[PDB]
Design goal:
Blueprint: E1 3-9, E2 16-21, H1 26-30, E3 33-35, E4 38-39, E5 53-56, H2 61-71, H3 78-89, E6 96-97, E7 100-101, H4 110-119, H5 129-139, H6 144-154, H7 164-173, E8 181-188, E9 192-199, H8 201-204, E10 205-207, H9 212-217, E11 219-220, E12 229-237, E13 240-253, E14 259-266, E15 269-277, E16 281-285, E17 288-292, E18 294-305, E19 308-310, H10 315-320
Parallel strand pairs: 1-5, 10-13
Antiparallel strand pairs: 1-2, 3-4, 3-5, 6-7, 8-9, 8-12, 11-12, 12-19, 13-18, 14-15, 14-18, 15-16, 16-17
Helix pairs in contact: 3-6, 5-6
Bound molecules: chloride ion (2 copies) and sodium ion (3 copies).
One chloride ion is lined by residues 72, 127-128, 174.
Zinc finger (C4-type): 188-225
LRR repeats: 116-138
Organism: Severe acute respiratory syndrome coronavirus 2
Length: 322
């Protein structure tokens, strides 16, 4: 019997010494097994494998705890999905574009590029150590592990079409937003008013208008007493807000927003671009960069800086002048 020593892991930090029989596959001994993303389940150990680290699934109590502590998931397919994605994302390129880590287009990944660019411009701290560690590396230019984690957390495979709003939602669900608070009021014709308080992810996301200013002034909505009704922002406490809507032609004005995403083309037949407001408006499209003084396009998501906002207008005034 010929053997080699290898290490198994679920978090690539805590290692577990193993002695493997070179006459059996990794799968026969460990279950599903990966070497830096590559599936070696059906491969028998090589001499060159000695001392190397292999990912396995969290198939015993120790690994189950290590994987939960690192990733904050007990989804049994998570490690396989992460490794499957990493085998691709490690071959992607991550150019620095206008000082930010982007992603060269591959595998329908434009939604990931604009999400990654956005993260580098808003204040957001991740909760799972896995995302903390990988995002730090991404900021330094080595974003393969971070991108593979995004795929795994969002349950998207490489090549699958993704939505930026949904992707940000998943990332925010794995981020510390406990201090974020939103208070809204709805004026329902002359039938009454209703205030609502939102926290965390729900305090920083809105679907229906791209304009933060319009949300402060008021948006028209239905209520039980008709379509003469107005919803507006009373109070906001957060370091950013994200305003989203179905793609529509929209003008982005320098200095009035932080960054945005555009979706050109048709449904499930299109492409995302990133627009960032710096000294001028830069459009980052993967590895590509252009500039303009004004930008108009089919915008889907706009990000704004915030700290603390409180309205200085009474309900009836928003209802009648928004
Ligand atoms: Cl972080
Ligand atoms: Cl989390
Ligand atoms: Na950030
Ligand atoms: Na950086
Ligand atoms: Na959270």
């Amino acid at each position: 019997v010929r053997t080699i020593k290898v290490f198994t892991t679920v978090d690539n930090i805590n290692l577990h010494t193993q002695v493997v029989d070179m006459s059996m596959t990794y799968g026969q001994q460990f279950g599903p097994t990966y070497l830096d993303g590559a599936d070696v389940t059906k491969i028998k150990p090589h001499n060159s494998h000695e001392g190397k680290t292999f990912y396995v699934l969290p198939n015993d109590d120790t690994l189950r705890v290590e994987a939960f502590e690192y990733y904050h998931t007990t989804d049994p397919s998570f490690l396989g999905r992460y490794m499957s994605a990493l085998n691709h994302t490690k071959k992607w390129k991550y150019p620095q574009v206008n000082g930010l880590t982007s992603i060269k287009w591959a595998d329908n990944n434009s939604y990931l590029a604009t999400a990654l660019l956005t993260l580098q411009q808003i204040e957001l701290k991740f909760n799972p150590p896995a995302l903390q560690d990988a995002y730090y590396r991404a900021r330094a230019g080595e974003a393969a592990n971070f991108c593979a984690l995004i795929l795994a957390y969002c349950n998207k495979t490489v090549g699958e079409l993704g939505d930026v709003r949904e992707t940000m939602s998943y990332l925010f669900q794995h981020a510390n937003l406990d201090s974020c608070k939103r208070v809204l009021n709805v004026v329902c014709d002359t039938c009454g008013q209703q205030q609502t308080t939102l926290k965390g992810v729900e305090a920083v996301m809105y679907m229906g208008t791209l304009s933060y200013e319009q949300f402060k002034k008021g948006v028209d909505i239905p209520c039980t007493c008709g379509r003469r009704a107005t919803k507006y922002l009373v109070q906001q406490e957060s370091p950013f807000v994200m305003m989203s809507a179905p793609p529509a032609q929209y003008e982005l004005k320098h200095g009035t927003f932080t960054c945005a995403s555009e979706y050109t083309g048709n449904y499930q037949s299109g492409h995302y671009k990133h627009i960032t407001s710096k000294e001028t408006l830069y459009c980052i499209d993967g590895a590509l960069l252009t500039k303009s003084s004004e930008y108009k396009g089919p915008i889907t998501d706009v990000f704004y800086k915030e700290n603390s906002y409180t309205t200085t207008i009474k309900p009836v005034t928003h209802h009648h002048h928004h």
